[PDB]
RNA sequence: UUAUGCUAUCAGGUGGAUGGCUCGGCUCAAGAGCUUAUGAAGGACGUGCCAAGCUGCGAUAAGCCCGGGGUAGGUG
RNA sequence: CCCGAGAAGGGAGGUGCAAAGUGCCUGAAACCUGAUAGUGAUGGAACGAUACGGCAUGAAAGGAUCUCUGGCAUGAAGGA
RNA sequence: UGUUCGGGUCGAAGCAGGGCUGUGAAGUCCUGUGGACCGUUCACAAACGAAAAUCCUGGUAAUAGUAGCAGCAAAGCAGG
C-alpha cells in the first residue's frame, strides 16, 4: 500500500535502481529467477530471461525442489517460469533506462542486487465441504535491483 | 452486570475445543475471566467501606502531641522548611485585621518567613504519570500556617499567597499540623489564639 | 584525582572477590535456551520431577547464599572506588575523594553536565562516565 | 490471606490441587453433619442436641442490680 | 464563564471544543496596544478583519498588515505578508492565532463596534 | 564459489505489541421530576446544487415568523 | 524531467527541524528476503554445564603493580 | 496518593544490542533509534508480577508451489 526502503545502500555516484510494486506472481518462482540472475550482466540477464520465456532454457531450483522432475543437461530438478521471468524483464527495462537518464553506461553494468519482499496479502475464500470455507489469498511481490558499475 | 448480560452456552466434548461458554450462534468464548470482554474475577465494590475510626482521647493526644512538635526548631528545620526566626512564632492579635495581600507579605518579609513562600512558589513542578488526566496536575509544598481565633478578614488576605494555609483556632486537624505524616510544620499564632487554647484539646 | 586508599586487608578482600566473581554461574533459568517465550532472569525451579531442582550436577547451579562475595569489598566498582549516583550539582559537596568517584545520571543534560564535571575536575574527585 | 507469599507456589497452601474443591472438602454447609460423622467436634463447640428447662416470661421477670458492702 | 467547579481537563476541552458559535466569538481575543488600551479602558479587545496587527511569536516576529480574513469554526486569522509557498510556487495566506497578535488599529464601521469592545 | 544446510548478529519486508495522548466510560453526591384525542412515545417514506450513511426536519420539509441577548461573518 | 500501454508504479529532483507520504506518532516478537562470522557432503541426537584450544571481534560504558613471562622471601595439610 | 529533593528539546518515556554491580528478584550506565514527559526520601494503598488451563483474542509457519481445477453432457480447428 505504501512505498519500501532497500536492504542494500549503493553509492549514488556508479549505482542505479528500480523496484516492482506489488506484483501478482508466486513468491518462490521469483525467487529462484532472483537466485539464478544475481551477478550477470544486464545483456546477459536479458537473453537468458528471452530464451526462458521461449522455453529453450530451464532454471534450476535448489531450495523449492518440489513438484519437478530433473531437466535435460547437466542439472537436477528445475522449470519454465514464465510470469515471473516477465515481471523481472519489465523491473530489469526499468532499472537500464534510469542508469541511462544517469549518464552510465548500461552494457557493461552487473545486477549485484536481486531480491524479494513479499507483501500484503488480499484475503479471499472458497467453499469446501460439509459447510467450511477455507482461506484461499493473493500473495504479491516486491522486487528490487541494483545495478552497479563495479563487478 | 459487567462483561455478564450474555447467554453463552458450552459446546460439552467431542466437538474437538475447550470448555468454556460460547455464543450460541459462533465459537467465541464469552462470561468467564479469561475470555476477551469476559467480567472481572474480583474488581472493586461500591458498597465496600473504607472508613477508618480512632477514639477521640487518642485522637486529641496526637493533635496536641503535633501541635507541641512546632515548638522545637529541629523538627521544623530537618523537615523541609527555611526560617530565620524565634520559635514558636506569636504576633500580636492586629494581625487578624490584615486585609490586602501586600500587607501580609510585608509582615512575612519583616518575620523571616518569606523565604518559605518563595521555596513553595517557586517549587511548584507538573506531576509525572495518570494524575494529570484526572485533575491533579502539579505537586505543590507547605510553606506555612497562621492561626487565628475568630472568623476575621485575615482569612481572606492571607489566602492567595502560595503554600500558605490560613485557618481558625476551632479547624485544627491532624493533617494541617502533620503533611505527610510528618510533624514540625512552620505555624504563627496570636494572642487570641492563645487564649483558646487554654483546654482546648484535654 | 585523590589515590584510592586500598588498606592491605581490604585489597587482600578485593583480589579475593575478583577471583571468586570470575568463576560464578550466570544463574539462567531452565530451558531458558530452548523456548524463545521465556526471558534469561532467574526464576526458581518448581516442579518436582526436574532435573535442575533435584540438583543434578550437569544441569547448572542453584542460587544460594554461598557466592556471595566479602562483606568488605561489597559493591566497589572494579577499579576500588565506591560509586554514588549524582543527579544535582547540590550533591558534590557530599563527596570525599579518597574513596568515592561519582557517577552522573544519565538523563542529565548537557550544559548541567559541562558544570557538574567543571566542578569535579576543580574538587578532584574522579568522574566514571564522562564524555571524554 | 497473604497472597504475595503465594506467587510461584502454585497450590497457595493448600496440598494437592485436588483440595478446596467446595463444600465437600469442610464436610457440608454450616453446622452440617450435626452427630453422624462431626459429632465430637459438635460436642466440643457447645453444640450438643438436646432441650432442657422453661423459660418465664420477660413482663414478670426481673433482674436485680446488686453492690456488695465492702 | 464557567466557575471553579470545572477544574476537570475533560469538562473543560468539552466546553471549547463543543461550543455554540456565538461563543467562538469571544476566542478572537488579542491585545491592545498601549494608546487603544488607555484610551478605551480594556485590557484586550477582538480581532475583527480591516485592522492591522502587529504579529508577537513564531516565524514572523514584527511584521505588520492588515487581517484579510477570519474563521471562526477553525479558530485562526489570516494576515498580510504572513505566506508559504507551495512546491510548484504559489504564495498562499498561512493561518495564526490571535492571541500571538497585537491590535494597533482599530477598524470602526460597524457603529455598534465600540459598544461591542467595552460594555 | 561446499551444493541442500546449522548457529548468532545486522539491513529490509510483513505485523501491530510497548510507550505517550484522549470531546469516551463508570461510581458517588446535590438538584429536578410526569406526558398524550388541541392526536403522544415509536416506526415507514420523503427532504440537500453536486448527497450514499448518521443527525435534524415534514410537500412552508439540515427548515418559516416574533421578542430579547450577540456582533461580523454563515452554509450539521 | 526520464522509463512505462498507463490517472498503475519506478528513478531523479523538491517541501518540511524531522517523511511523519495519507488507516500517515513510536514501530517489538513470531514469520519471510539478503549480507556478514564460525562450521560444513565419513557423519549420532534434550540442543547445555565445567576445563582446555582454533577462527572472528574486543570504539563507549571494564582492568594499568592490570595482562604475559620470570627472580627472590615466608609458606598450612601433604611430602618425595 | 500524601510529603521531601530533583531531571528533560544542549533531547523524557519506550525499543534493539552491550559494560558494571548484587547469591537473586533487579538496579544503573553506554551506543543506535525516538520527539515529550519522568523520577526520588519517609509512609500508605491495589482492577499489582504468567510458560502451561484439548486457556481467550489477534498475527503468522511447516505441510507446499502440494491436493483440487477428471468420473453424470470426452469439443474444437482454419482464415480475418
Ligand atoms: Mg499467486
Ligand atoms: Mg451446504
Ligand atoms: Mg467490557
Ligand atoms: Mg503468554
Known amino acids: 500500500m505504501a512505498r519500501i526502503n532497500y536492504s542494500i545502500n549503493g553509492d549514488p555516484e556508479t549505482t542505479s535502481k528500480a523496484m516492482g510494486s506489488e506484483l501478482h506472481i508466486s513468491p518462490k518462482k521469483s525467487r529462484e529467477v532472483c537466485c539464478k540472475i544475481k551477478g550477470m550482466k544486464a545483456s546477459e540477464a536479458r537473453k537468458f530471461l528471452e530464451d526462458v520465456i521461449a522455453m529453450k532454457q530451464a532454471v534450476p531450483f535448489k531450495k523449492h525442489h518440489d513438484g519437478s522432475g530433473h531437466r535435460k543437461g547437466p542439472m537436477a530438478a528445475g522449470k519454465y517460469p514464465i510470469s515471473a521471468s516477465k515481471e523481472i524483464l519489465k523491473v530489469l527495462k526499468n532499472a537500464e533506462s534510469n542508469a541511462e537518464y544517469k549518464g552510465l553506461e548500461p552494457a557493461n553494468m552487473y545486477i549485484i542486487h536481486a531480491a524479494i519482499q513479499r507483501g500484503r496479502v488480499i484475503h479471499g475464500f472458497m467453499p469446501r465441504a460439509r459447510g467450511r470455507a477455507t482461506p484461499k489469498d493473493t500473495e504479491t511481490v516486491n522486487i528490487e535491483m541494483i545495478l552497479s558499475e563495479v563487478r | 452486570y459487567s462483561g455478564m448480560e450474555t447467554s453463552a452456552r458450552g459446546w460439552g466434548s467431542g466437538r474437538g475445543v475447550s470448555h468454556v461458554p460460547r455464543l450460541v450462534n459462533s465459537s467465541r468464548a464469552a462470561r468467564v475471566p479469561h475470555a476477551k470482554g469476559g467480567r472481572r474475577a474480583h474488581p472493586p465494590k461500591p458498597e465496600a467501606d473504607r472508613s477508618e475510626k480512632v477514639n477521640t482521647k487518642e485522637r486529641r493526644y496526637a493533635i496536641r502531641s ?43 518579609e519583616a518575620a523571616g518567613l518569606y523565604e518559605d513562600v518563595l521555596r513553595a512558589k517557586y517549587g511548584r513542578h507538573i506531576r509525572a504519570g495518570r494524575g494529570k488526566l484526572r485533575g491533579r496536575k502539579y505537586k505543590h509544598k507547605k510553606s506555612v500556617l497562621i492561626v487565628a481565633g475568630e472568623n476575621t478578614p485575615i482569612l481572606k488576605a492571607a489566602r492567595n499567597l502560595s503554600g500558605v494555609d490560613v485557618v481558625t483556632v476551632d479547624s485544627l486537624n491532624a493533617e494541617l499540623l502533620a503533611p505527610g505524616t510528618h510533624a514540625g510544620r512552620l505555624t504563627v499564632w496570636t494572642e487570641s489564639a492563645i487564649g483558646k487554647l487554654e483546654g482546648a484539646f484535654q | 584525582v585523590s589515590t584510592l586508599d586500598m588498606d592491605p586487608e581490604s585489597r587482600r578482600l578485593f583480589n579475593v572477590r575478583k577471583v571468586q566473581k570470575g568463576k560464578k554461574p550466570q544463574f ?105 | 490471606m497473604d497472597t504475595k507469599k503465594f506467587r510461584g507456589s502454585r497450590t497457595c497452601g493448600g496440598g494437592t490441587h485436588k483440595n478446596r474443591r467446595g463444600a465437600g472438602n469442610r464436610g457440608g454447609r454450616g453446622k452440617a453433619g450435626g452427630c453422624k460423622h462431626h459429632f465430637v467436634r459438635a460436642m466440643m463447640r457447645g453444640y450438643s442436641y438436646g432441650k432442657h428447662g422453661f423459660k418465664r416470661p420477660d413482663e414478670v421477670s426481673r433482674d436485680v442490680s446488686i453492690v456488695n458492702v465492702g | 464563564m464557567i466557575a471553579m467547579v470545572s477544574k476537570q481537563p475533560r469538562k473543560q476541552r468539552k466546553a471549547r471544543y463543543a461550543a455554540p458559535l456565538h461563543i467562538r466569538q469571544k476566542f478572537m481575543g488579542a491585545r491592545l496596544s498601549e494608546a487603544l488600551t488607555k484610551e478605551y ?79
Not at chain 3, 86 to 97: G, H, K, R, T
Request: hydrophobic content about 35%; proline content about 4%.
Open chain 2, 66 to 108: 503535633a501541635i507541641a512538635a512546632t515548638t522545637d526548631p529541629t523538627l521544623v528545620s530537618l523537615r523541609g522548611h527555611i526560617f530565620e526566626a524565634e520559635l514558636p512564632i506569636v504576633a500580636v492579635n492586629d494581625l487578624e485585621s490584615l486585609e490586602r495581600t501586600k500587607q501580609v507579605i510585608e509582615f512575612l
Open chain 3, 28 to 132: 539462567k533459568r531452565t530451558c531458558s535456551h530452548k523456548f524463545k517465550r521465556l526471558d534469561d532472569n532467574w526464576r526458581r525451579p518448581r516442579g518436582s520431577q526436574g532435573k535442575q531442582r533435584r540438583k543434578y550436577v550437569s544441569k547448572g547451579a542453584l542460587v544460594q547464599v554461598g557466592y556471595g562475595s566479602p562483606a568488605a569489598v561489597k559493591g566497589l566498582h572494579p577499579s576500588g572506588y565506591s560509586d554514588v549516583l549524582i543527579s544535582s550539582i547540590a550533591e558534590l559537596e557530599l563527596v570525599d575523594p579518597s574513596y568515592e568517584a561519582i557517577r552522573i545520571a544519565g538523563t542529565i543534560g548537557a550544559q548541567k553536565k559541562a558544570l557538574i564535571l567543571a566542578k569535579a575536575e576543580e574538587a578532584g574527585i574522579k568522574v566514571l562516565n564522562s564524555g571524554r
Open chain 5, 41 to 119: 479602558g480594556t485590557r484586550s479587545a477582538a480581532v475583527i478583519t480591516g485592522d492591522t496587527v502587529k504579529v508577537m511569536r513564531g516565524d514572523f516576529k514584527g511584521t505588520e498588515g492588515k487581517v484579510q480574513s477570519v474563521s471562526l469554526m477553525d479558530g485562526t486569522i489570516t494576515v498580510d505578508g504572513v505566506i508559504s509557498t507551495k512546491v510548484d510556487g504559489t504564495e498562499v495566506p498561512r493561518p495564526l492565532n490571535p492571541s500571538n497578535v497585537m491590535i494597533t488599529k482599530l477598524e470602526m464601521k460597524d457603529g455598534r463596534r465600540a459598544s461591542s469592545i467595552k460594555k
